[PDB]
Amino acid sequence: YTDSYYKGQTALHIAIERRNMTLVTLLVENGADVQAAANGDFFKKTKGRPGFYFGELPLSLAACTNQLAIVKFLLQNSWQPADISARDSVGNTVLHALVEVADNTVDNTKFVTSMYNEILILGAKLHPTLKLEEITNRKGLTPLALAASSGKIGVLAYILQREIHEPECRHLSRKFTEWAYGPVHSSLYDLSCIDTCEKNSVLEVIAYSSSETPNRHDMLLVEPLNRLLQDKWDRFVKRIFYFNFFVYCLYMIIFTAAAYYRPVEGLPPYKLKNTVGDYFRVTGEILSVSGGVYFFFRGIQYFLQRRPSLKSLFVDSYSEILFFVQSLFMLVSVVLYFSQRKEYVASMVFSLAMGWTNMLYYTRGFQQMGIYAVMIEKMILRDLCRFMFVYLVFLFGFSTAVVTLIEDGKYNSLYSTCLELFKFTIGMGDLEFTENYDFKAVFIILLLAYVILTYILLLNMLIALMGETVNKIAQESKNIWKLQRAITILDTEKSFLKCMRKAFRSGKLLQVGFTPDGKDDYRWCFRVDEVNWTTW
Amino acid sequence: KSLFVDSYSEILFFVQSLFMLVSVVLYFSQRKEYVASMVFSLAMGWTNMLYYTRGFQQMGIYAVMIEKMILRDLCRFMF
Amino acid sequence: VYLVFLFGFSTAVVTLIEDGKYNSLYSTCLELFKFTIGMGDLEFTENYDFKAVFIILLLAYVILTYILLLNMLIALMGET
Amino acid sequence: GKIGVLAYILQREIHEPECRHLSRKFTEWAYGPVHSSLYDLSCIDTCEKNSVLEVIAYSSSETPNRHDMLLVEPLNRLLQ
Numbered sequence: 001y002t003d004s005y006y007k008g009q010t011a012l013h014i015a016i017e018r019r020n021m022t023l024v025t026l027l028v029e030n031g032a033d034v035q036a037a038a039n040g041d042f043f044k045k046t047k048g049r050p051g052f053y054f055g056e057l058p059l060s061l062a063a064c065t066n067q068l069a070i071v072k073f074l075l076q077n078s079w080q081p082a083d084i085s086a087r088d089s090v091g092n093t094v095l096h097a098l099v100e101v102a103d104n105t106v107d108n109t110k111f112v113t114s115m116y117n118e119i120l121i122l123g124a125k126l127h128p129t130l131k132l133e134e135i136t137n138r139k140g141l142t143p144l145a146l147a148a149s150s151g152k153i154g155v156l157a158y159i160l161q162r163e164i165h166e167p168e169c170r171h172l173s174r175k176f177t178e179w180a181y182g183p184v185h186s187s188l189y190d191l192s193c194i195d196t197c198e199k200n201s202v203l204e205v206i207a208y209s210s211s212e213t214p215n216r217h218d219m220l221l222v223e224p225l226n227r228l229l230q231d232k233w234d235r236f237v238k239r240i241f242y243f244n245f246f247v248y249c250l251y252m253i254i255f256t257a258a259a260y261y262r263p264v265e266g267l268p269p270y271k272l273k274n275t276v277g278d279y280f281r282v283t284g285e286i287l288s289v290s291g292g293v294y295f296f297f298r299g300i301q302y303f304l305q306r307r308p309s310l311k312s313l314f315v316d317s318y319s320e321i322l323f324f325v326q327s328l329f330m331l332v333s334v335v336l337y338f339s340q341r342k343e344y345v346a347s348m349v350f351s352l353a354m355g356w357t358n359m360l361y362y363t364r365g366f367q368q369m370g371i372y373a374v375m376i377e378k379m380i381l382r383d384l385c386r387f388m389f390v391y392l393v394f395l396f397g398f399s400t401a402v403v404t405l406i407e408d409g410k411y412n413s414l415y416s417t418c419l420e421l422f423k424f425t426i427g428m429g430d431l432e433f434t435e436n437y438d439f440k441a442v443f444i445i446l447l448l449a450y451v452i453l454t455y456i457l458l459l460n461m462l463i464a465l466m467g468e469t470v471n472k473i474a475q476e477s478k479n480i481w482k483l484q485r486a487i488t489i490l491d492t493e494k495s496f497l498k499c500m501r502k503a504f505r506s507g508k509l510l511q512v513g514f515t516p517d518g519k520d521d522y523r524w525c526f527r528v529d530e531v532n533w534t535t536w
Numbered sequence: 537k538s539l540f541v542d543s544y545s546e547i548l549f550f551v552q553s554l555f556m557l558v559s560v561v562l563y564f565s566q567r568k569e570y571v572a573s574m575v576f577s578l579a580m581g582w583t584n585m586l587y588y589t590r591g592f593q594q595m596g597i598y599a600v601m602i603e604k605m606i607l608r609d610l611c612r613f614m615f
Numbered sequence: 616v617y618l619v620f621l622f623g624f625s626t627a628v629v630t631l632i633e634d635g636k637y638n639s640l641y642s643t644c645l646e647l648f649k650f651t652i653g654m655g656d657l658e659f660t661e662n663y664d665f666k667a668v669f670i671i672l673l674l675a676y677v678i679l680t681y682i683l684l685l686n687m688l689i690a691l692m693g694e695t
Numbered sequence: 696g697k698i699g700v701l702a703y704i705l706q707r708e709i710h711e712p713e714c715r716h717l718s719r720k721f722t723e724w725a726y727g728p729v730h731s732s733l734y735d736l737s738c739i740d741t742c743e744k745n746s747v748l749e750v751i752a753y754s755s756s757e758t759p760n761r762h763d764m765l766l767v768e769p770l771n772r773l774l775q
């Protein structure tokens with residue numbers, strides 16, 4: 001085809017689609033180009049149009065459709081064998097395509113894992129010196145990195161625990177068994193491109209996901225990742241986390257002390273008196289502003305490094321947004337302070353409040369507290385927002401009714417009546433707060449209707465809905481806790497402030513000692529003991 | 537019977553308008569009681585804003601659940 | 616969690632208040648605590664400037680603690 | 696309110712010569728696992744008198760499954 005929609009499609013592609021082994025054999029026999037790239041729009045992702053992306057190549061097409069016989073033929077035909085390492089216009093190989101077509105369903109994932117395995121075996125058999133799994137597409141992603149980024153948990157789970165029991169394919173494995181006693185045996189996970197690598201370490205890809213990856217909560221449950229994160233935590237990060245928490249606590253105490261003893265004279269900035277208390281006060285103020293600047297620049301670092309696309313900028317990393325807002329309030333307070341405006345106080349208190357509230361960020365890393373904080377966040381985003389919309393509609397409607405009814409009274413104003421009706425919500429509503437009206441029956445009927453709708457119905461409904469929510473987000477909260485542990489571990493090991501290399505764990509062990517050549521393979525493996533009472 | 541077991545929003549908007557018209561009649565009738573009518577319409581008007589929560593997936597469900605809570609649980613409880 | 620919130624907003628409010636009857640961490644802490652037991656005054660002082668800031672802080676505290684946290688506690692106990 | 700019968704009819708597909716024209720669901724193209732089907736929509740969107748959507752929506756509230764019938768695939772996608 002020459003049209004842009006089916007561009008590049010030929011007889012071989014059609015033969016593969018129809019699953020006709022005979023026609024494929026004849027076409028290859030007749031000199032068909034096994035590398036003919038079908039790169040029309042119909043064979044691209046292109047979400048706004050129909051299509052089917054399969055890597056544009058006949059080998060990739062056979063692999064994606066669970067046609068193993070055609071794959072073996074295309075790789076090992078006499079007339080024109082296919083290039084196993086060929087790449088499409090995106091740079092994707094067959095393995096990248098197999099990652100792409102994954103969707104974590106049992107039937108899809110089963111054959112996707114099996115075909116991926118078979119391709120690896122064949123690639124070893126035809127090209128022992130070729131390392132397919134290191135090839136990157138135009139995005140720099142290996143098949144493992146692509147699977148981790150796209151959330152294809154099934155494929156990732158297969159790869160990370162890949163063990164191949166046959167001669168001359170042992171080196172492809174990533175899970176090894178070093179020694180075995182009876183029910184107990186000690187396995188080794190490879191951890192290359194998991195712990196640390198050039199660009200797309202799997203932990204870094206998962207933790208810094210865009211929050212729209214399907215299974216980002218579940219991917220860290222995979223055995224080697226969870227054990228590695230726990231090891232990093234216990235060995236290196238736990239004490240540092242506690243230290244950071246302690247330092248933040250000291251910072252908040254200092255900020256509180258500095259703000260509490262602010263002077264009450266007008267027109268800042270204030271002349272420093274030659275007395276001990278004021279030297280300590282100004283010192284605390286300087287430390288507070290310093291911390292504000294620190295968190296400000298960390299926030300900018302976050303935004304630039306992650307480049308959230310204006311929706312990921314808010315729906316996730318809620319904590320960094322809040323810390324950044326605290327720093328903004330601190331800096332605006334500084335500007336107003338040196339601007340000779342009293343309004344700096346109005347900024348400072350907000351920062352102070354935010355600071356103490358942001359203490360809850362450090363609840364994560366405790367299994368029980370972090371779930372609590374996670375549920376707070378999710379409730380604020382969903383249920384409190386919906387409730388506040390409805391409640392404010394009722395509040396404003398009945399406030400307007402009551403303030404209209406009242407005439408030439410103390411209240412007689414939208415603010416006062418809104419406040420006085422709000423007092424019903426907190427269990428302080430007077431219910432006789434004024435007599436400056438006519439038609440007392442109308443007044444009392446309005447208040448009773450408001451009370452029944454808001455206090456009795458809506459608040460109790462809110463409690464019921466929050467119960468329904470927690471019943472559904474308990475397990476999601478558990479996985480989110482694990483996710484944050486992963487995130488803090490990565491940030492701690494990447495910042496590290498001291499060029500300390502002990503964070504690199506698991507030790508340089510020898511896996512096989514016999515690569516495709518005579519060399520020996522050292523792969524920094526991570527040891528995991530297991531016990532099993534079957535398969536003696 | 538279908539007039540009352542279903543189509544509550546039509547009832548509520550119609551009743552609001554009835555309160556408004558009664559307010560007009562009282563207003564030109566030289567009775568201060570028009571205020572008593574007007575405020576009721578005003579209150580109902582704002583609550584009828586919830587009618588428009590349909591067309592939003594998140595809020596529409598919430599409005600439906602409020603409707604069902606009123607019709608079942610609040611009615612039983614208030615009795 | 617509640618004590619974190621209470622202390623944070625008490626510190627903010629007592630910072631905002633100046634040369635008033637309350638003007639002290641203990642009294643303001645107690646006064647904000649009164650909201651939890653359904654006795655919060657919500658206009659317990661005028662010894663400040665920036666009425667908008669003070670009332671905003673009190674409303675935010677009320678919503679965060681009284682509305683969200685207590686009902687959330689009920690939900691968590693129900694799960695337990 | 697006979698949801699089962701309606702659910703059958705609206706996605707009815709007949710695979711034989713001289714009875715294709717009775718079908719209301721068609722498959723235009725099917726490439727790999729992906730295939731583009733077509734729903735007939737005669738007298739669902741608009742009809743002489745009793746369009747299916749009009750009948751369901753303006754039902755008398757005593758129909759059994761009036762809430763559930765819009766879960767039938769072509770209707771839900773059409774309404775969206």
Ligand SMILES: C=C(C)[C@]12C[C@@H](C)[C@@]34O[C@](Cc5ccccc5)(O[C@@H]1[C@@H]3C=C(COC(=O)Cc1ccc(O)c(OC)c1)C[C@]1(O)C(=O)C(C)=C[C@@H]41)O2
Pocket residue numbers: 318319320321322323325350353354357358359360361373374376377674675678679
């Ligand atoms: C979500 C946005 C960014 C938000 C930021 C500020 C302005 C905030 O007001 C809100 C608006 C608001 C205020 C009061 C009631 C409802 C909503 O809610 C939060 C935000 C509301 C919060 C919620 O408290 C928390 O987020 C604790 C927390 C939970 C999980 C986290 O990962 C976390 O990271 C630090 C912090 C506290 C305030 O920051 C706060 O203490 C002050 C004085 C106002 C609250 O805006």
Ligand SMILES: CCCCCCCCCCCCC(=O)O[C@@H](COC(=O)CCC)COP(=O)(O)O[C@H]1[C@H](O)[C@@H](O)[C@@H](O)[C@@H](O)[C@@H]1O
Pocket residue numbers: 449542543544545546548579580583584586587602603604606607756
């Ligand atoms: C003095 C002031 C008092 C205010 C009193 C009123 C408070 C609520 C006001 C909120 C307004 C919402 C609204 O306008 O109506 C809502 C809520 O109704 C009520 O709860 C009134 C309680 C009486 C649902 O109305 P809806 O039109 O969707 O009815 C549905 C049909 O359409 C649909 O086909 C189904 O058959 C479905 O079973 C039907 O329900």
